[PDB]
Design a protein around this ligand. Sequence first.
Ligand SMILES: N[C@@H](Cc1ccc(O)cc1)C(=O)O
Ligand SMILES: N[C@@H](Cc1ccccc1)C(=O)O
Ligand SMILES: N[C@@H](Cc1ccccc1)C(=O)O
Ligand SMILES: [Cl-]
Ligand SMILES: [Cl-]
Ligand SMILES: [Cl-]
Ligand SMILES: [Mn+2]
Ligand SMILES: [Mn+2]
Lengths: 452, 448
Amino acid sequence: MNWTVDIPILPPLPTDLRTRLDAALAKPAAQQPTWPADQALAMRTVLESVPPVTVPSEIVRLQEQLAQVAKGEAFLLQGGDCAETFMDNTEPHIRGNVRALLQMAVVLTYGASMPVVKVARIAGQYAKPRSADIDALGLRSYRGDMINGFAPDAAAREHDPSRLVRAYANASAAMNLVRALTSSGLASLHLVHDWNREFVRTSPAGARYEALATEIDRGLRFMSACGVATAEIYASHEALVLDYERAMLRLSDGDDGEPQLFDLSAHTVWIGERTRQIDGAHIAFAQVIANPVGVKLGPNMTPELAVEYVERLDPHNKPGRLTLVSRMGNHKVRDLLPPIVEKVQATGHQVIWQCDPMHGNTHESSTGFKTRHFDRIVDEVQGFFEVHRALGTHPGGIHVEITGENVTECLGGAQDISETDLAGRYETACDPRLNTQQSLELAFLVAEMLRD
Amino acid sequence: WTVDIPIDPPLPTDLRTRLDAALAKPAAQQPTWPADQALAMRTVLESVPPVTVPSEIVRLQEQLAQVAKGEAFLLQGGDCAETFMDNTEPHIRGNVRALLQMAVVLTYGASMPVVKVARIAGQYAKPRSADIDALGLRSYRGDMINGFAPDAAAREHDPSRLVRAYANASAAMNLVRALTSSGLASLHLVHDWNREFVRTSPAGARYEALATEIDRGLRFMSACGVAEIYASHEALVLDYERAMLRLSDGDDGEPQLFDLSAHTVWIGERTRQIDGAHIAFAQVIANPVGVKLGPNMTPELAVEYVERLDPHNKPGRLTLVSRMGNHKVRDLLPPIVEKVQATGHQVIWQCDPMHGNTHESSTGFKTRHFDRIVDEVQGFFEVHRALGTHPGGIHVEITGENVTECLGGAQDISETDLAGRYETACDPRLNTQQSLELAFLVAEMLRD
Ligand SMILES: N[C@@H](Cc1ccc(O)cc1)C(=O)O
Ligand SMILES: N[C@@H](Cc1ccccc1)C(=O)O
Ligand SMILES: N[C@@H](Cc1ccccc1)C(=O)O
Ligand SMILES: [Cl-]
Ligand SMILES: [Cl-]
Ligand SMILES: [Cl-]
Ligand SMILES: [Mn+2]
Ligand SMILES: [Mn+2]
């Protein structure tokens, strides 16, 4: 049961982009998939002619909005599934993740009293890194459906290069739908916030959030009363699989009218903690592409390394071109983040300081499932805000993993999801996502932090 | 040469009973693949993100209702036969562009809004009059069914092309959306290409006036202080259109069935049996639908389409597409217009000046004579002016490439030129210049 694509039988790069790109891919790359270099090459030839998932004008537009975030004048909300599955690439799932992001954005916008840039982990998040190459059941590790199968069989965990095309096909389908949803009635702010006032009515913790959901309702009605009457959701994934990102590269006149290389698998991509080798091919790939890029910074980050990233990835001091995504865990952020900020801020580069309160607070549960505690996530964002407020720098955004489904993958929250509940609805293919109820809860709380 | 791509919430029972009964009618021109495999691929397509959403169809239904009511013009165009291997960024990009160029021109001459409908994101299947072609092979019936390659294997009907077709359709509709919401939207840009057309083109002097007159309205627009492209294909492979059915509510309040593989679909000359499955399928879906009408159309039968496909007198919901041939449109059409108008139904009279003017070229290729296309639209207008009806739109076959599939126009493509760039996998298309030329000419027909 399978379909079949023909292998073809694009214009040459200017010599410098040819060289820098070939130079960049020559360098070592962690966590890449093992599969025949000639099969991967067949895939990349398919992917080199397909209609792009994004287009350059949209990436330039995001670069401009992200510059406003960098400069303290807007706020970045990045969210979505931890790992996208070809299995769940369905309208109800996409719609509920779009809805979830749009809801959090209204709340965050009112809290920040400034615009929120919405970026979804969607339309390409089909690949993850693995600390160990053999998993709990002695099997080859699952690396995301761009690589192998979540199914726990020896045959499913084989790295299949055809999943490159299967990943693009799913990606541009989900993107088509995202485009359609965000230009439909789903985007209307008044519609989107009624979903939030529903949440307050039906939630156990409605009381904690009702005053604010009502303040927002009055802000929206205030708009209408003044004579006002859409949405932009950008695509992002971790750029982990260089074969994929290579194929999706397209050449176009850029911010300066000279030809640049845009990675059109998404609008923005981030290198993760296990792949940010400073002299590696990931970081060097990031130096050839025009896209906004981000870098995960965990607890072993030094102010001086952080600065080297800033000087390599933001060579031209383009505010908002580089995002630095902090994930230290709550007990470490207040101590570790300030020195990094002070030294980076001192260079004169305007980075976006994005908080990631998820990948620093995971812990195996007493049930066998890997989970995260709501109260620890809150604490790190809070701690992240405390540190930026102390320094006078901009808390530029968050980076959360969520679904529009009432899964039970994270503890606590309004539902006091306990360790014996994490088995009732553990849908995720990788890390524990906050269900929709905990998504909005956090958005409300982060909105409170944004206020004064 | 190829690679295998692996694979791995029902509708209400009262709508399936209705639907299963409608689809029990006889369907022409259908694939001959095993129903169990078809059923597997359908179950796949039953769960994928839709190519369109109901709010866009309800929205199109609103815009088309104004075409019927006389206050807007329908521009429908694109490739004759989409192929998976030409479904590329440049090709999509130049068909979007060409279609935007024609719409600016037509909007000015019509002095009213122009709905833009592309043949794209699903136009992967054609009927065939003979199931053995001139190579003595099973005929090519579109990439949704089999392969353009001459050989027994390629020509076998492959139901996994249902999925490959949807994939190509999504990827292309995702790009059209990106394109229409970026710089390509901008009129002053789209028309600056129209003025490259006039600079380069040989007939430049024939169109320099109107091109300048428009550039001045655009500057006037700007001085005074001051895009949607819909998708459509012929609904042919019914395993596809029915797997792409989704349930939501529209202009009613009750939940309707939409076919979310496109925004509007039409039923071809060879599938419109009043009691066949295709007409019965259009009955059931909420999408705007069109029906092709050739020379052997009784004024009586046009009316039975109107009663069967516009049962609730919704203007624009039904379009009737003239495809008579220039030599026949002026005489064969008027009685059809009359008989339908007198029924109290508002429909879109749309002109297809191509699918009935295809003449074999002395050099082997099937082609079309520019002067005969232009002349059928012209005669199509002369009818409607004479009858006081609304010339509702054109349905046209174009590409953004400089192919040489049609005869005449600016470049004066001749019997021997057809071999230069005959790139269509089916009918011959007006190249970029001829699409624009025709656009200017139809603007003058619309002129006050
Ligand atoms: N896709 C090519 C690079 C490339 C990109 C765009 C081009 O126009 C040309 C070449 C690679 O992976 O090496
Ligand atoms: N059009 C090519 C490549 C493609 C694959 C998947 C989706 C879109 C395009 C094919 O069908 O083989
Ligand atoms: N998600 C399914 C269906 C699908 C096919 C092709 C494109 C998009 C979705 C798959 O991976 O096959
Ligand atoms: Cl662009
Ligand atoms: Cl038949
Ligand atoms: Cl084919
Ligand atoms: Mn994760
Ligand atoms: Mn045709």
